[PDB]
Amino acid sequence: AMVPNVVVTGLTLVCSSAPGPLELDLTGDLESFKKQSFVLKEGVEYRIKISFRVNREIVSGMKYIQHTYRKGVKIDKTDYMVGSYGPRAEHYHFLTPVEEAPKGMLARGSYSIKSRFTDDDKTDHLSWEWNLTIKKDW
C-alpha cells in the first residue's frame, strides 16, 4: 500500500452492438456493483477486458477466474490464463477469447458473477462481484 504490486482498475464488456459503454471502475466502491447490472442482448458476441497496472515486480502466471451463478446456484466456472507482465505506468488490457451471451427465453434474466484476478502465487490481486442481465433486446 498505497499502491501494492498489482492494481486492477477496470472490467469492460467489449461488445460491438451494445448501445452504450459497459464498464466497471474497480478502483472505486466495489459494493456498488452488487446493486447494478450490465444488460446483454441474448446470443451476442462479447469479450471481457480486464485493465490493470503492475508497480514493482514482474508477475507471472496471471489468471482471471470467473464464477457464474443463477438463482444463487453455481453454474459455470472459467479460468483464463492472462500471462506475465512487468511494472510500468501504462495500463495493461487483458481480453478473454470471444464469448456468446446465452439465448432463448429460458436463458434470459439476471446472473451473478464472482471475479478474481490472481497469479501463480495465488495472490488475491482483486476479487469483486457484478451482475449480468440477458434480455431479448437491448
UniProtKB/Swiss-Prot annotation:
Disease per record is: Nephrotic syndrome 8: A form of nephrotic syndrome, a renal disease clinically characterized by progressive renal failure, severe proteinuria, hypoalbuminemia, hyperlipidemia and edema. Kidney biopsies show diffuse mesangial sclerosis, with small glomeruli, hypercellularity, increased extracellular matrix, and contracted/collapsed glomerular tufts surrounded by immature or abnormal podocytes.
> Which residues of the intact protein are shown?
67 to 202 of 204
Q: Which key words tag this protein in UniProt?
A: Acetylation, Cytoplasm, Disease variant, GTPase activation, Isopeptide bond, Phosphoprotein, Ubl conjugation
- Species annotation: Homo sapiens (Human)
Q: Which gene encodes it?
A: ARHGDIA
Cross-link Glycyl lysine isopeptide (Lys-Gly) (interchain with G-Cter in SUMO2), residue numbers?
A: K74, K77
What is the recorded name of this protein?
Rho GDP-dissociation inhibitor 1
From the broadest rank down, the organism's phylogenetic lineage runs: Eukaryota, Metazoa, Chordata, Craniata, Vertebrata
> GO CC terms on record?
cytoskeleton; cytosol; extracellular exosome; immunological synapse; membrane; nucleus; Schaffer collateral - CA1 synapse
Q: Which family does it belong to?
A: Belongs to the Rho GDI family.
Reported effect, K135A = Loss of interaction with NGFR
The free-text function statement in the UniProt record for this protein reads: Controls Rho proteins homeostasis. Regulates the GDP/GTP exchange reaction of the Rho proteins by inhibiting the dissociation of GDP from them, and the subsequent binding of GTP to them. Retains Rho proteins such as CDC42, RAC1 and RHOA in an inactive cytosolic pool, regulating their stability and protecting them from degradation. Actively involved in the recycling and distribution of activated Rho GTPases in the cell, mediates extraction from membranes of both inactive and activated molecules due its exceptionally high affinity for prenylated forms.
